[PDB]
Write a protein that binds this DNA or RNA. Structure first.
Length: 59
DNA sequence: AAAAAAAGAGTTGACACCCGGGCGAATCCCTGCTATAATGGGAGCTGTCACGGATGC
């Protein structure tokens, strides 16, 4: 009863939902790429590159 | 009238062996990934009363 009294169906609504999810992921990625918090934090792992353990195929 | 040894103890090397702990190897359990379109559910009484109590205007 609860699922039927509040839910519906949408053919093209799934496309809009996917576009909204993609926009949210894009905005989150744009907001997470900052300076002195994420660049220097992840750079300590990028400096470990050259051994092929987690620098390539992992990060 | 005397006087020493098969047992009885006591060990000393000499195997026979019997589960324990590793070294392997062979093999179980988990977990996730599959891209045409899938869009609200199946029994069950209903052939006992009667009492004793719990809601309602």
């Amino acid at each position: 009863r609860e699922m039927g009294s509040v839910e519906l169906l949408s053919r093209e609504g799934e496309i809009a939902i996917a576009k909204r999810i993609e926009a949210g992921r894009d905005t989150m990625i744009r907001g997470l790429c900052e300076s002195a918090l994420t660049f220097e934090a992840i750079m300590v792992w990028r400096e470990e590159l050259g051994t092929g353990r987690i620098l390539l195929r992992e990060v």
